[PDB]
Structure formats: structure tokens, C-alpha cells
Amino acid sequence: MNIMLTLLTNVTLASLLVLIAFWLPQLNAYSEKTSPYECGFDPMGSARLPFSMKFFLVAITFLLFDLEIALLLPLPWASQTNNLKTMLTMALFLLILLAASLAYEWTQKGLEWAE
Amino acid sequence: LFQAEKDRRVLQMLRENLEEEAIIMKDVPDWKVGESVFHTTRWVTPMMGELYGLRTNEEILSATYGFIWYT
Amino acid sequence: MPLVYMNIIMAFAIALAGLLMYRSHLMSSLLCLEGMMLSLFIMSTLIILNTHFTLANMMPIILLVFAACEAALGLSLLVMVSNTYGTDYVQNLNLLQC
Amino acid sequence: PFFDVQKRLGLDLDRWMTIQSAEQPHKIPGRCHAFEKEWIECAHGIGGIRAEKECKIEFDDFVECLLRQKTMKRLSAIKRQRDKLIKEGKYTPPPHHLGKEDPRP
Amino acid sequence: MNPIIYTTLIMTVMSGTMLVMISSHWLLIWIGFEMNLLAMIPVLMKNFNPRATEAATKYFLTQATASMMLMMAIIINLLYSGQWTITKMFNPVAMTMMTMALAMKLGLSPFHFWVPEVTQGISLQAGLLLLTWQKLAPLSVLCQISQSINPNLMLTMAMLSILIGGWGGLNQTQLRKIMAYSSIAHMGWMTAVLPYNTTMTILNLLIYITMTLAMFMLLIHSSATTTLSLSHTWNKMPVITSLMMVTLLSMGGLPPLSGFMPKWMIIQEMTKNESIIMPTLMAMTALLNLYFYMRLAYSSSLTMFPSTNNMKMKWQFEHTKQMKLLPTMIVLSTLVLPMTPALSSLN
Amino acid sequence: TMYIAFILSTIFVIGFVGFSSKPSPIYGGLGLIVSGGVGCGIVLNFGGSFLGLMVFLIYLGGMLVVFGYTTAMATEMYPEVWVSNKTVFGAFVSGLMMEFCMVYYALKEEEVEIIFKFNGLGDWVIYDTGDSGFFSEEAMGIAALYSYGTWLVIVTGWSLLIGVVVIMEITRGN
Amino acid sequence: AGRIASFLKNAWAKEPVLVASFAIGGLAIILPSLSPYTNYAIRINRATPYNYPVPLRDDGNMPDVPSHPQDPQGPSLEWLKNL
Amino acid sequence: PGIVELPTLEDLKVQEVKVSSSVLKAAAHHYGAQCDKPNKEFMLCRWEEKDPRRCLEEGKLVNQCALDFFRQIKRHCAEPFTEYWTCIDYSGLQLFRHCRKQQAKFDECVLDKLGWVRPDLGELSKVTKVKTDRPLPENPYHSRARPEPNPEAEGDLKPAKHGSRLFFWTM
Amino acid sequence: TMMSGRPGRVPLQFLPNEARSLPPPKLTDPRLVYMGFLGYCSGLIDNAIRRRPVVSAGLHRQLLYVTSFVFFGYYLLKRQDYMYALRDHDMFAYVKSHPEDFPEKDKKTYGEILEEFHPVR
């Protein structure tokens, strides 16, 4: 409830700022002013053409490692268990497998951007 | 102590709901007041609908969401 | 069953019908595939939290993990297809016939 | 098809997680622990066919605890009758239901 | 692909299938399916070309959809029962979803198109692994949940599979697509008997796997992927063509070969349950499979097609790699009919 | 009552209708992000704060990669939006109409679909009266992944490592 | 041994970050099995009363079960008190 | 099926303990040490009967012991106790760590006026034993008679008569 | 699954302890001889595929084929016989336990039974 009210307040303040920005000043618009910016000359192509991503593999590895950290996040509560040895073994197992993934990709050149 | 208070409060709300149901569902043709929906005679913990059913929206909301919304 | 479960199952059905009806892009179908697992996550956690199945709380996390593995696999296949054909269009995957 | 390596080797790989009447952390009970226990004990050792024929009462109670369909039907019927009686002014809620009472601690 | 990475991926596929077979928890069964698919995609893409990439993409899309539907069925079953154990499913809607998902995984009609497409896309070794192992897992799940299977849905999909396999195989001229349509028909037979005797399902699975292994290994030995490529094998190694012809006769279900045993046992078992129209239609429709097996046998062994001039150099050279258990697969797929009552040991 | 869970579920369905009408992967990701946040809200109301925040964070991370990929792989000259195309707008309107029809029928009467039976009553009604004490049941059950669930950790970690190997192998080329 | 020393000196001159990472990880794996306080941590976790200690029905043959919390019988946390 | 039985509002009536959570938390260790026996009897009843309706008298006794304990405190150490629970009530988490002086004064007052010794660390959490006259419930779950098990295999194994009997096979 | 889940069944056990009370197959069993024949055929096919003299080459290899087939066939025959004995045991026990379902019927002679006569002409 309080968090919903806080989010509503923040969104309303930002929207009011946008509304004041777009309605208070004097406006003069013409085709030359609203043209896209490319340092004084016209753009040759379109900004919607495909843009090669040289780190496409690091992105996939990021997805996998992000869910690894999702697995790792509940560790502070896992430390209150009576099975401390089993908990410690499995935590270190997950971290060692994450390290193994990083080592494999690093040695197999997955961290190098495409040329 | 809180266990005893909880038992007394739950049973009191159940009895009050039963009395109100008896007053309301008095002309319904096939309706027995206080009938259980379980075959077994073992005590079954009431859900929030059975306790805060015929009560105000304020009490309903406090019971159902007061803890989660309290920050 | 509450109406919340009805809405979650309806969202799953919508995301399933989205996947089965391709338009042109393979990426849009992958996004439909990711929505299905999100609805599965939400439905599973709603069922588990309501019933106080304490030991089952870890199941949605494993569900998310294998959703991530599927998304990674699909993105890898998408980059290979795009390298071969110039676009992620599904019309180019027509070399093999039934 | 099913190779019961767990049963053969005495292992426990997922049988802990199969049911909610099993051992839970900090002895937290399930919502329908008693119903599930009764149904499992009834259906133990008689197979699926006889278990479905004979433990139907226990299973019906278990499903009622799980989904609460008969209870919601009763609650909705009572709510509809109360609203209909209030519409014509034939019913007056008591003060303890209207919020003019002091409950127990 | 590095040999170590390849063998670890093969072991991961096998580990996923074994997890599916040994688990008693629906979540663990789903995990096994996911692990199998994840490690199976690179195996399909092992030899990089656009056809392999397309086949892997189609296989991934189909299997991901099937896994999603399977998890939805599992969750719906949990909603109405609170049970994670794999037994009879407590909701008819969940059972229908599960049947659809497992049929899509197996390639039963009308979920069959990916089977010929992917098999033609991938190499012979990859197709062998695909057909064999990827039929091995979902059928074990179906056998576990057989007592809740809807007979009407299962038998409808089985008859559709038999008909579609026969007709597609009739049209095809590529060996891998022929194998895929044959696989669809055999899956139809197995799932037709499934709601009555899982023992007969297992027997048909074993015989089909043996015949498919022998056939695929003969194709790999002869390096033939089309009909006309296989028509040159009589001028290089006439023994392989003869063994392939006997194996094709066995696959078509002719007595007294080993392909007759599953059809015979399934017809008998279904007749015990007062099914006559279904076994008669199933038996009559297999004549289509026999027809295109016989068409393949005419080209390769019973007639001598023209050869080329470089076959002389091929004569001068010798085959190096030795197929593992090829003679055993040839014998088991043709000569084990007198050993039929061992299905009780299989029980 | 306040019907907060029902309103959030409706918004969840609306976001699904959006990205399943499939305008273009940019707006598909936008709709999926909205649905993830709204589902986080739904499960926060039902009790699971960790599960809600975790699914929200995971989908925020996942959709970040999808943006970079659709910029590179799945872009065209004029990306399609919901009103830009006749097919996309038709599917979006169909989904919204279906959701509105089912919501109205459920609110007006206890709607039994051709698949499942649904009762129009309180999500607050379905809740449980009992309470825990001085610990969170959800947190303890999730933390039981390391004490219990040793097998799950093993299979999950093996799957993640093999996933790294697989993504490296698929994109090898040559 | 000489090869090991040369390898370590080369790594410390080229990848000190990796040398430190492996040293910290190796110590983290090994030290808990040698520490005498792991059992103390387990005992401290077992000694936390998260839920209610439901009493037993006295059969008259339970000499090790206290009749009152302050009776000498029962577990003692005097070890944790001076720790 | 049947009609549930609910106690009337007359026998649910009892003298309530109308102190606040801060007041209860201040006098919690002494309360657990002094009113242990009625509370243990009530908790054993609640866990064995699994029914609120079967342990109402034990709840009445619990309330009576609480009221007697608080009257005994009020008669002798009202001022130190008021200072102590006033200190506890300030904290948002109601921490014992911030009110050690007032706690010391209260413990000194109850040790001299009433001879009360506060329990040490780890004592109130011990599992104790209770002597009661109420019989042990035979069927607390109200279970039914279990279905009779299937008969077990008996006798020794003989070879199958005439073999497999599978069509024309003689073995 | 008829006999899967029969009470007292140990998982993953090819041959239980209760199978030891059955007569083991004779080593000259025709089924064992046929398994040996299958091994011999596999050996000949191996020689033919590898382009060695079919009957002469690889005598040690052919012996290994035959021996392996006879070994596995012996154990397979034991398991098959055990399963059939188990089936008959269960069937007889059920018939004994359900007399009202398997009643003994009074035998009537053909002098008492009347059958319609259908002439062939």
C-alpha cells in the first residue's frame, strides 16, 4: 500500500515535469530543426539497420551466470541450517562449477570479441 | 497465552457466524445451518472466508493483507 | 479455484498460441517461449505458497534456471541462422521438406 | 521404463520432495497435512485400483482441503442470500459484524 | 567439435534420459528432458552447414514447445492433487496435455513433420542417435503413466502415425526421410499397443531399435544417403546389399523374420481386449511400409544398376573403420523369431 | 478485498496479449518486462517476496540481452508496433476482447470454462488463517535447497556448465 | 619442485589476480575441515529455538527429561555462554 | 454431512489479560518460570487433542495463572516493573539489549520481595514432561478402519505347467 | 503392466532368490543350441563383412561369439522360466481364493446334451 503510493507519487511527479516541459515554453518546429543529428551532415543510412554485436557470446554467458547468482542468493538463510557441512559442500560445489565455466570459456576464447 | 486467546477468538467468531447464518438462511428450502463440507468429524482449521466473511471490509483487509502491506 | 488461477492459465494459453503462430521473426517466437515459462513460474509459486508446501519453494527457481538454459540455446540457434541467411526470418528455414 | 535405483540402493533423491506430509524444515506443517496423511495411510499397500475405489472419502476430503470448492460454494450462497435480504431491508447485521465491538485479545 | 566435448555431450544426453527413467518426481523428469534437449542440439549441429542449423532450429522449437506443455500439465496435476509423484494423473485436462506433449516429443501424428525434416537435415550418426535414444525416453514416461492414458486419444494418434508413415515413405526417395517415416509408423504401432500391454510396447521398442541400428549402420558403412547412391553398392561390397535386403524384409514384417514378432504379439494382445477393427486396419496399412522397403530392395540388391568408372579405384581400396556390433544387430534383427517367449523375461 | 490480485492478474494477461501479438521484439520485450513486474506484484501479495523479486530480476537481466540481440539480429527498416499492422492490431484486439469477456463472465457468475471450473469470490477468502513465527516459510523452504535437495543442486550445476559448453559449441561455425 | 616454483613465480609476475583467486579459493575449501569451530557452529544452530518445545507426557520413566525448565536435567548452554 | 459443534459464547468467557506486548515481554522469563505448569499442561492438551474445543479449561487455567502472576508483581514491584516495560516499549523491535539497568532493578526487586530467579540462557526452550490425568486420545485424527491388505504369496514355486503355453511352443 | 509391482519384487534384480527352487535349463536345451547358432551366424557375418574367409578365418573370434550367446541365453532362459512359473502360481492362487468366480460345473454327457444337426447336402 505505502509502496504503491510511493510509486504513484514518483511517477506523477515525473509525468508532471514532462508535461510542464512540453507545454510551458514557446515552440517553433520545422522540418530542419527536427531532423536527425549526425554532426551537421545528413545520415547516409538508417539508424534501424542491423548493428553487429561483437560480444554476442558474452551475453549468453551472462544469462547463464545471472541465473547462477540467482541460485546463490538464498545463501544467507542457508547458513542457519543444522546441516552445515552439506550446505557448505553444495555452496562450494556451485561456486566451483561457476569458476569452471568461466575457466572453460576463457581458455576456449569465448571472452574475446569478434573481429 | 496467545494460543489460548487464539482458540477462544476463533471459536467465538465461528459461533457468531453460525448464529448469523441461522438468522439469514432460515427460509432456504434445503439448507442445514452449520453443516460441514468434510466427511470427517476431525476439527478443521477455518479459512479466512469462514471467519471474516460477514464482517467489514476494513477488518477483512487487515486480516488478509495487514502484515504484508505493513512497511 | 480463484479467478487469479484462471488469469494465469489464460496468460499461459495466450503465450502458447503466440508461439504456435509465427509471423516473420524468430525472436518474437522466442519471446513468446519466455512468456510461457514466466506464467508457469507464477502459477507454480501461487499454488505452492497457498498450500504451505515448504520444501517445494525451490521448484520455481529450478524452473527459472532451465528457462534460462532454453533461452540461451534459442539465442545461439538464432545467431547461427542469422549468420547464414542475413535475417532471423523463419521463411528461410525451408531447405528441409516433409 | 521406471528403474527404481533409489529403492534398490536405499537412496533418497526426490522422495523427500514428493509429498507435503514428509519431513519439512523447522517442522513447518502443510496446509492439508492431516488430510494427506489420512489419505496416504488409507491408500498404502492396496494398489491404485483399490485405492481409488476405497479411499475415495479420504481423497475427497483432501481435495476439499486443497481447493476449497464446497466451502466457497457455501460462502457464496450465504453472501447472496444476505445481500438479497439486505436489498429488501429484511436483515440487519449485528454491531459485532458491522464493526462496533471489542474483540478478544 | 573436440572428441572430449563430443563424448561429454553424448554422456549428458544419456544422463538426461537416465534421469527421466530413474526419477520418481515430475520435476526431475522435466529436468531430464531439458538436459537431454540441451546436450542434444550440438550433436545435431556437429557438422556445420545450413541444413544442420535448420534441423537443429526446428528440433529445438518443437522440443521446447513440448517441454512447456509438459510442465503445464505437471503443474495442473499438482493443483488438483498436491502430488509430485509420477502415477495416474488426477486431472483429465492435465492428462490430455501430458499426452499431447509426449506425442509431440515422440513424433506421433499429427506432430510428425519435424521427424523427416530433422532426420534429412542431420547426418547418419546423428539420425541414428535421434531416432533410437530420443524415442527411448518419452516412451518410458508413457509406460509409467499408461493407466490414465485416454484410449481414444492414444489410438487415434497411433492410427494416424501408421497411415502417415506409410504414405510419406511411399513418396520419399531419400534414405534418411525413408527412415524417418518408417520410424513414425513403428511409433504408431508401439503406442497403439501401449494402453493394453506396456510389455508389448517394450518388446516392439527393442525390436525396432535393433532393426534401426542395423539399417543405419549399414547405410553408414556403405556411405549411401540416396537411392541412386545405394544402387552403386552392389559393385563394391555385394554382401552389405544382401544383409540390407534381409533387414528390409525383416522391417516390413514378413515371417519368419524378427519384424513379425512385434506385430504378431500386438495383434494378439489387442484381440484379447476385444479389438478387431483396429488390429485389422493396422495390419493392412503396414503393406505400404513393406512396399517402399521392397522398392528400396529392388534398387540395391535384387537388380544391378549401372555403375561408374572410379568404382575400380574403390575396388582397389578397403574399408578401414569397423562398425561396432553390426553382425550382432544384423542377426538379432532377422533370426530371433524362435525366441519369442523371452518377452516374459522382458515382463 | 480491494481486488488487487485480480487487477494485477488482468494486467499480467494484458502484457501477455501484447508480446504474443508480437509487434516487434523491442515492444515484445517491453510487454514481457511489464508482465514480469506485475507477476512480481501478484506473488508479493500472495506472500513470496523473494520469489517475486527474483523472477523480476531474472527477467530484467534476460530482456537486456534480447534488446541487444534484436538491435543486431531482429531489426528492420520500420519496426512494427501494435497499431502499425493490421494483423498485430487484430490479434491484440482479439486477446483483449477475450480477456474482457472472461473477466466479465467470471464477475457476473461462477464461470465454468470448457477446461476448468472457476468460482468468483475472494482471493482473500481462499487464504489461510494460520501464521508462522520469527521466520519466513518461503525463505526457509528456498534455503532448504542446500541442506535438502543435494540432487537438485548437482543436476542444476551440471546443466549450467553443459549449457556454457553448448553455447560455445553451437556458435563455433567452420 | 623447481618447475613448480618457476610456474608460481611466472604466474605471480603475470597473473597476480589469478594467483590470489586460487589461493583464496583453496583456503576456503580446505580450512573448514581443519577448524575446530565447525562443530561449535553446528551446535549454535541446533540451539536456536525457532518453534515451541512441545512437552512430553510423563510416563514416570523419564529420568533425563526435566519437570521444570530450571531443573538440572536438560540441555545446557553454559558452553555458549562463555564463548 | 454432519453439523459442526461449537462451544456457546457463555463458556468461551474468561477474564482477559489486558496488558500490552511490551508489558508481556518485560515479564516473560519470570512468567515462563513461574506459570510453567499450567502452560505446559495446556500445550500438551493442544498438541494431543488437535482441537481447540477440547482444551478450553486448560486455557482458562492459563489465563488464571497469568492474572495471578501479574497481581503478585503489581503488589510488590510495580514501580521497577513499570520503569522496565516503559524502557522496553520505546524500542521498535522491543530489544532487551537497551534496557539492562531497568531489567537489573526489576530482577533485584522480584528476587527479594518474591524470591524469583530468572531462567538462564537455554532453559525456557527445554522440552519438559507433564503429569496429567486426562487420558491419551486413542483416535485424535478421527480415522476410519483401514482397508484390509491383499493376501500375500504362499507356498513354494513349481515350474509352469506345460511351459509357456505360447501358441506352438512346447517349452 | 501386469506383473510389475507384484508384492515382494526387488527392483533391478534379474533373478530373485525364489528362482533357485526351479529346475535349471539343461545345457543341451534346444533354445540354448539356437542361441549358439545365432552366435555362429554372427561370427560368419562378421567374417563376411570384414572380407575374411567366412568359415576359416577368426576361429577364436567365432568361438567367443558362440560362447557369449550361450552364456546370455542360459541366463535369459532362467529368467523366462521363472516369470512363467510365477504367472502360473499367481493364477492358481487367485482361482483357489475366488471359488465363487471359478465354480466347478457339473459334467453332462453327450447322451444328455442336445445339439442341433446341420446336414451337408
Ligand SMILES: CCCCCCCCCCCCCCCCCC(=O)OC[C@H](COP(=O)([O-])OCC[N+](C)(C)C)OC(=O)CCCCCCCCCCCCCCCCC
Ligand atoms: C525547476 C523545475 C520546474 C520548472 C517549472 C517552471 C519554471 C519557470 C517558472 C517561470 C516561468 C515564467 C513564464 C515563462 C513562459 C515561457 C516564455 C515564453 O514562451 O515567452 C514567449 C511567448 C511570446 O508570446 P507571443 O504571443 O508574444 O508570441 C507569438 C509567437 N511568436 C514568438 C512567433 C511571435 O510568451 C508567451 O506566450 C507568454 C505566455 C504567458 C506567460 C506566463 C504564463 C506562465 C506563468 C508561470 C507561473 C508559475 C506556475 C505555472 C508554471 C509551471 C510551474 C508550476
Ligand SMILES: CCCCCCCCCCCCCCCCC[C@@H](O)O[C@H](CO[C@H](O)CCCCCCCCCCCCCCC)COP(=O)(O)OCC[N+](C)(C)C
Ligand atoms: C559376457 C556374456 C554375454 C553378456 C552380453 C550382455 C548383453 C545383454 C546385457 C544384459 C541386459 C540385462 C541386464 C541384466 C542386469 C540388470 C537386471 C535388471 O535390469 O533386470 C530386470 C529387467 O531387465 C530387463 O527388463 C529384461 C532383460 C531381458 C531383455 C532381453 C530379452 C528381450 C526379449 C527378446 C525376445 C526375442 C530375442 C531373444 C534374445 C535373443 C529388472 O527388472 P525391473 O528393474 O524391475 O524393471 C523395471 C521396468 N519394467 C518393470 C517395466 C520392466
Ligand SMILES: CCCCCCCCCCCCCCCCCC(=O)OC[C@H](COP(=O)(O)OCCN)OC(=O)CCCCCCCCCCCCCCCCC
Ligand atoms: C557385455 C558387453 C557385450 C558387447 C561387447 C562388444 C565388444 C566388441 C564390439 C565390436 C564388434 C564385435 C567384435 C568384432 C571384432 C573386433 C576386432 C577384433 O579382432 O576383436 C577381437 C575380439 C577378441 O575378444 P576380446 O576383446 O579379447 O574379449 C573381451 C576381453 N575382455 O573379438 C571379439 O571380441 C569378438 C566377439 C565379441 C562378442 C560377441 C558379440 C556380442 C555378444 C553379445 C551376447 C548377448 C546377445 C545379445 C546382444 C545384444 C547387444 C549387445
